[PDB]
Amino acid sequence: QPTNGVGYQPYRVVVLSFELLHAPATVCGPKKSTNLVKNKCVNFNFNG
């Protein structure tokens, strides 16, 4: 109905699922790159 109210109101979305940190890193969300400094404590970043 158009007058459904609380407890009968309808849902319309395309439902999906994702399972993460169990996948290869094809396309992933970005951060700002630096250069490859050796023999210094740095931050490594690959899938979080």
Partner 1 sequence: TPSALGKLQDVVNQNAQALNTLVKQLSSNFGAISSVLNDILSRLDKPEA
Q: Does 48 bind partner 1 (CB under 8 A)?
A: yes
- Please tell me whether residue 14 binds partner 1 under the rule CB under 8 A: no
Alpha-carbon distance of 8 to 48, in angstroms, equals 41
Indicate whether 21 belongs to the interface with partner 1 (CB under 8 A): yes
When binding is defined by CB under 8 A, the residue of 20, 25, 37, 41 that contacts partner 1 is 20
Residue with tokens 């931050």: 43
Say how far residue 46 (Cα) sits from the centre of its chain.
14
Q: Which helix (H) or strand (E) holds 8?
A: none
Does 47 bind partner 1 (CB under 8 A)? Our answer is yes
Q: Applying CB under 8 A, which residues contact partner 1? A: 20-21, 47-48
